Amino acid sequence: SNPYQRGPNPTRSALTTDGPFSVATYSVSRLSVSGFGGGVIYYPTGTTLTFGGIAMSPGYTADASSLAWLGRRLASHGFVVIVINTNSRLDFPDSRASQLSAALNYLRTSSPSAVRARLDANRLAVAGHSMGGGATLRISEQIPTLKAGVPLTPWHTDKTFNTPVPQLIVGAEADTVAPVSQHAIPFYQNLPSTTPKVYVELDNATHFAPNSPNAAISVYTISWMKLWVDNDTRYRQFLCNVNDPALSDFRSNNRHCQL
């Protein structure tokens, strides 16, 4: 019996809409926190259970609203999610990584009591778009107790990240901002061979696909978070033996397909 398992047995279709948990939102004002620019918390309501936490970073120039659909999507599947605003819209990936760390500390320590009541403070993960995807890789190096990272169409000047944190990297096949041959794929290849890793390549997609509702991004992000944050092996089925019309490529070392 897995004490972290939440929700009914999944289907692929179920991972393309908001999940079964009702969601509350809390706006974190810039002037109320230090180390990051505030943001929005999405968290489950109507429940006595606790859930893992996820911090998400937008990309260059963007704010938390650019990932609002995804923060709510994840929270509704059973997670406490903070989507950050950054100190400056022009912050680069390593700065964003520091701010994700500050946001996770805040989430665990100083967020509203109703948020902390829903949070298992020890089961945490990260995701982000573009420069925020680079930040996801960087913070995974810095905090190797994180349970998972999901870099979405990631961008970073550094290509090698030494982390044991399982990563599912989403590339956009037709990306010209962070071309997968120069960003996503090198990131995937250069992670340690012993780290569980997946590369999902969205067929014909472009750089800003993650900022709009996207069924494939939802399926793979929920599944990776469930598998690693909750140890929920019911989600292996979406990550193994994959033949998905939305994808132009799927690569993995398949460490996640077994215990």
Amino acid at 23: V
Phi, psi of 125 (to 5 degrees): -145, 170
Q: How would DSSP label each residue in 77-120?
A: TT-EEEEEPPSSTT--HHHHHHHHHHHHHHHHHTS-HHHHTTEE
Q: What is the rounded CA–CA span in Å between residue 63 and residue 170?
A: 20
* Structure token pair of residue 234: 């019911």
Phi, psi of 45 (to 5 degrees): -130, 170
Contact criterion met (CB below 8 Å) for 256 and 227: yes
Phi, psi of 111 (to 5 degrees): -65, 170
Q: Of residues 66, 95, 111, 130, which has the active-site annotation? A: 130
Contact criterion met (CB below 8 Å) for 235 and 166: no
188 DSSP 8-state letter: H
130 is catalytic: yes
Q: What is the rounded CA–CA span in Å between residue 60 and residue 240?
A: 33
Q: Of residues 175, 218, 232, 256, which has the active-site annotation? A: 175
**Helix (H) or strand (E) run with residue 42 in it:** strand 39-45
Q: Of residues 129, 183, 207, 256, which has the active-site annotation? A: 207
129 is catalytic: no
Contact criterion met (CB below 8 Å) for 175 and 156: no
Contact criterion met (CB below 8 Å) for 156 and 187: yes
Enzyme catalytic residues: 130, 175, 207
